[PDB]
Amino acid sequence: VPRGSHMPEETQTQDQPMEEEEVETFAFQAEIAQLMSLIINTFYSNKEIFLRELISNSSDALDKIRYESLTDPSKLDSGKELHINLIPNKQDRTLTIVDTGIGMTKADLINNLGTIAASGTKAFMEALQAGADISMIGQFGVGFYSAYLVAEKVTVITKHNDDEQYAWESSAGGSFTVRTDTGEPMGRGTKVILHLKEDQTEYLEERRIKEIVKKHSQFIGYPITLFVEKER
Ligand SMILES: Nc1ncnc2c1ncn2[C@@H]1O[C@H](COP(=O)(O)OP(=O)(O)O)[C@@H](O)[C@H]1O
Ligand SMILES: [Mg+2]
Ligand SMILES: [Mg+2]
């Protein structure tokens, strides 16, 4: 019976029930798979333009918030700032691009990030064979896959007002997964987590990140902030 003091193990709360996350696996559309293999396995001198492409996608998503308010004003009542955060993590070798844009639903991840061919994909691959600069990518409707210039794996966590939170992930190799994400709620918007290749760790350094934002992304139209972890 009587106790005056308990040890931590004794008062540890019972876990919450384990949750199921549904996972689905999809092949990339053929030309997207071919483009990813070309991007991954070819040397380019201008790999830094991946960040321009990801920032442009965030800016497009943030522009959609403003305009969706013309057909659904309730979004004006959100208190979230429309912004982009860049978050390098040296410990994990990741660079994360976070925005408070519209987010993507599950079917948006499946249809917009791998299973549908952009009409320009074949033309762009021929331009690259003919020696085009990789910087031309986004003009061909396939800018997202520039992430694989620097990343060995990409994870996209996203939440749109009309669906639950999802995670898309791919290490290339011809397929990607989409799985419900019952982890840390991120609130409306998208987080693209780049797991950087070992020779691409310059993109974790604050001066390099500032250099490429100022070179290539000066008309975002929204505040961008770079979080720098304090050196211990
Ligand atoms: N940060 C993001 N927020 C919302 N949707 C995104 C984001 N990044 C990519 N997307 C979705 O992925 C699609 C493909 O992106 P991309 O390959 O850059 O082509 P594009 O920007 O020309 O449409 C976008 O059209 C958009 O629907
Ligand atoms: Mg784009
Ligand atoms: Mg703009």
Curated annotation (Swiss-Prot):
Coiled-coil parts of chain: none
Source taxon at top rank: Eukaryota
Modification sites for Phosphothreonine: 11, 13
Residues carrying N6-acetyllysine: 64, 90
Residue sites binding ATP per the record: 57, 99, 118, 144
Entry's transmembrane regions: none
Cell location: Nucleus; Cytoplasm; Melanosome; Cell membrane
Annotated stretches, region: Interaction with NR3C1: 15-232
Documented effect of changing residue 53 to A: Strong ATP-binding. Strong interaction with HSF1, HIF1A, ERBB2, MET, KEAP1 and RHOBTB2. No effect on interaction with TSC1
Comment field on protein domains: The TPR repeat-binding motif mediates interaction with TPR repeat-containing proteins like the co-chaperone STUB1.
UniProt record similarity statement: Belongs to the heat shock protein 90 family.
Stated name of the protein: Heat shock protein HSP 90-alpha
Organism of derivation: Homo sapiens
Gene for this chain: HSP90AA1
Residues of the full protein shown: 1 to 226 of 732
